[PDB]
Amino acid sequence: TPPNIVLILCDDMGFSDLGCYGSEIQTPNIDRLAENGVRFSLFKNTGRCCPSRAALLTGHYQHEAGMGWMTAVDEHRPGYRGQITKNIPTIAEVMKANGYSTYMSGKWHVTVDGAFDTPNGSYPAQRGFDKYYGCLSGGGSYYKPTPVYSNLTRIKEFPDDYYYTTAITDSAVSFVKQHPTDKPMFMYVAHYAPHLPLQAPADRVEKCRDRYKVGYDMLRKQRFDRLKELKFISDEMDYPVYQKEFDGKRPSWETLTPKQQEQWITDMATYAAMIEIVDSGIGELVETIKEKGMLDNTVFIFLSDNGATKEGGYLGQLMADLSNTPYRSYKSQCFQGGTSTPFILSYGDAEKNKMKGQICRQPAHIIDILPTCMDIATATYPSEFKENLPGKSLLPPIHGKKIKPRELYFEHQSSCAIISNHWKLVRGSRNEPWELIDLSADPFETKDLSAQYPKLVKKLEAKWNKWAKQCNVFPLENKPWTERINYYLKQNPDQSGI
Numbered sequence: 001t002p003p004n005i006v007l008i009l010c011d012d013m014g015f016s017d018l019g020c021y022g023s024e025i026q027t028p029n030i031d032r033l034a035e036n037g038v039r040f041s042l043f044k045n046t047g048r049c050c051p052s053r054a055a056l057l058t059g060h061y062q063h064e065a066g067m068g069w070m071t072a073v074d075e076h077r078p079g080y081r082g083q084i085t086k087n088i089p090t091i092a093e094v095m096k097a098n099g100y101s102t103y104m105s106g107k108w109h110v111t112v113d114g115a116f117d118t119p120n121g122s123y124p125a126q127r128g129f130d131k132y133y134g135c136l137s138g139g140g141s142y143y144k145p146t147p148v149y150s151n152l153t154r155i156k157e158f159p160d161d162y163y164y165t166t167a168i169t170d171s172a173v174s175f176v177k178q179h180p181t182d183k184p185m186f187m188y189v190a191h192y193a194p195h196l197p198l199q200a201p202a203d204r205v206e207k208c209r210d211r212y213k214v215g216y217d218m219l220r221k222q223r224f225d226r227l228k229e230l231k232f233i234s235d236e237m238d239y240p241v242y243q244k245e246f247d248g249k250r251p252s253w254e255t256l257t258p259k260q261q262e263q264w265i266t267d268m269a270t271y272a273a274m275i276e277i278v279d280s281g282i283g284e285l286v287e288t289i290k291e292k293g294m295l296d297n298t299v300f301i302f303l304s305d306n307g308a309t310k311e312g313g314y315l316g317q318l319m320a321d322l323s324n325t326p327y328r329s330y331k332s333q334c335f336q337g338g339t340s341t342p343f344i345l346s347y348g349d350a351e352k353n354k355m356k357g358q359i360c361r362q363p364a365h366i367i368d369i370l371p372t373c374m375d376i377a378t379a380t381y382p383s384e385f386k387e388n389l390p391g392k393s394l395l396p397p398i399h400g401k402k403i404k405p406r407e408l409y410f411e412h413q414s415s416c417a418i419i420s421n422h423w424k425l426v427r428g429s430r431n432e433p434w435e436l437i438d439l440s441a442d443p444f445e446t447k448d449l450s451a452q453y454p455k456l457v458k459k460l461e462a463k464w465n466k467w468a469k470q471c472n473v474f475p476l477e478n479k480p481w482t483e484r485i486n487y488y489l490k491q492n493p494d495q496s497g498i
C-alpha cells in the first residue's frame with residue numbers, strides 16, 4: 001500500500017512553543033518526530049483558524065475556497081461564505097479517491113456557525129472523512145465543546161472527566177486500532193490545544209508552574225538563545241523587543257504587580273500543560289501505529305493553524321509575545337508572529353528521512369500540505385475536477401533537490417502581505433501603510449524600506465492586488481467581530497450554508 005499519513009494540526013500554537021523550536025514547554029514525542037525527520041524554518045499559515053483550515057483542506061487560498069474570514073457569518077458574496085465550497089475537493093476526498101481510509105479527530109471550523117444543528121453538506125463525514133469525532137465549532141470549553149459529532153450523529157452527553165484534548169487523542173487512537181492494515185490510512189488530528197480558554201488538569205498545570213516563576217522576559221530571551229543554538233536564527237541577530245504592538249509601553253516583568261505576575265505564571269503554566277497533554281497524546285498515537293505494524297509505512301506531519309493570540313487580554317498578549325518568539329504581532333494579522341508555524345515531516349522508516357534531525361529552509365505555505373500528501377501517496381486528483389493547485393510538494397527539497405523561489409499571499413481583516421523571493425510587503429490593516437521588509441536581512445520585520453524602494457513597493461502591491469482580485473478577496477472588510485457579524489446577519493440572516 002502507499003504510505004499512511006498522520007497529519008497533526010495544533011490551534012493558535014506560536015513559532016517557538018515546541019521544545020525542538022526552542023521552548024521551555026516539554027514536547028518529547030513531537031521532538032522525537034523532529035529528530036527522526038525534518039523541521040522547516042520558513043513554513044507560513046494564513047494567520048487565522050478558518051482560513052488556515054480551508055487552505056489546508058483544499059490546497060487553495062482561503063478566499064478561493066469561500067473562507068476569506070470565519071465561520072461566524074456567511075457574507076453571501078464571493079470569497080466570504082463562512083464555509084468551504086463543494087466546488088474544490090478536500091484532502092480527505094482526494095485521498096479517498098486514491099483508496100485511502102480517511103479519519104478525522106477534533107476541530108473542524110469550516111462549517112458556517114448557523115449550520116451546527118443539522119448536516120448541510122459541509123460536515124467532515126460529508127467532505128471525504130469515513131470517520132469523524134470532534135466539535136465543529138472554533139471556540140468553547142475543553143469540558144463541554146458544542147456541537148460534538150460522531151460522523152453525522154450529535155453527541156449531547158459527556159463522561160464526567162471529559163477533556164476535549166484527551167477525547168481527540170482517544171478517538172484518533174481508536175481509529176488507528178480499528179484500521180485494516182491492508183489499506184492506506186489518511187488521519188487528520190485537529191487538536192484544540194492550545195486554543196483558549198486556558199483549561200488543563202491541575203496536576204499537569206502544577207507540573208509546568210515552577211519554570212514560569214522567572215517571568216516572560218527571562219523565558220523569552222532563553223527561547224531566542226535556543227533558536228540560535230538550534231540554527232533557526234543567525235548568531236549575529238539582536239534580541240527583538242517589540243514596542244509598537246504595546247503602544248510604546250511594553251511592560252517588563254518587574255513592572256507587573258505580584259497579583260499580575262502570579263496570574264501570568266498560572267496562565268502560561270496552564271498553556272504549557274495544554275501543549276504537554278497534546279504531546280503525551282501524540283506519544284500514544286505513535287505507540288498505536290507501532291503496535292499495528294504501520295510505523296515503517298507511515299509519514300507524520302505536525303504544524304499550527306496560526307500564531308499565538310492576544311485575544312485573552314493584557315497578560316495574554318505577553319504570553320503570545322513569548323510564544324511567537326522571535327516574531328512580532330499575533331493571530332489575525334499577516335506579520336511573522338501570526339503566520340509563522342513549526343512544520344515537521346517525519347517518516348516512520350528511519351531510512352526514508354534524508355535530512356534526519358536537520359532544518360529545511362524551503363519557503364512554504366499551508367497550501368503546500370495537499371500537494372505534499374498527494375506526492376507521498378502518488379495520488380491522482382479526482383477526475384471530475386480540474387487540478388489547479390497553487391502550492392508545491394515539499395518532498396523534493398527534503399530529498400536533496402534545490403530550494404525553489406516562492407510567491408506567497410496573505411489577507412485577513414484587511415491585514416495584507418505578499419512574500420516574493422526575499423521581499424515581504426505587509427500592512428496591519430487598510431488604515432496602515434504598506435511596509436517593505438527584506439526577510440533575508442530583517443526576518444523580524446523591524447526596518448521598513450518602503451521609502452528606499454518605491455518602484456518595488458508598487459510592483460509587489462500590483463502582484464498582491466492581481467492575486468486578491470482573482471481569489472475574490474475584494475472588497476476588503478475590517479469591521480470588528482461583533483459589528484461585522486451583526487452587519488452581515490442584517491444583510492442576510494440565512495446562515496444555513498446550503
Ligand SMILES: CC(=O)N[C@@H]1[C@@H](O)[C@H](O[C@@H]2O[C@H](CO)[C@H](O)[C@H](O)[C@H]2O)[C@@H](CO)O[C@@H]1O
Pocket residue numbers: 049137138139140311481482
Ligand atoms: C462572544 C464574542 O463575541 N467573542 C469574540 C470571540 O469569539 C472572537 O474569537 C474567535 O472566536 C471564534 C469562535 O468560534 C474562534 O474561537 C476563533 O478562534 C477566535 O479568533 C474574538 C476575535 O477577536 O472576539 C470576541 O472575543
Ligand SMILES: [Ca+2]
Pocket residue numbers: 011012048049195305306
Ligand atoms: Ca487557530
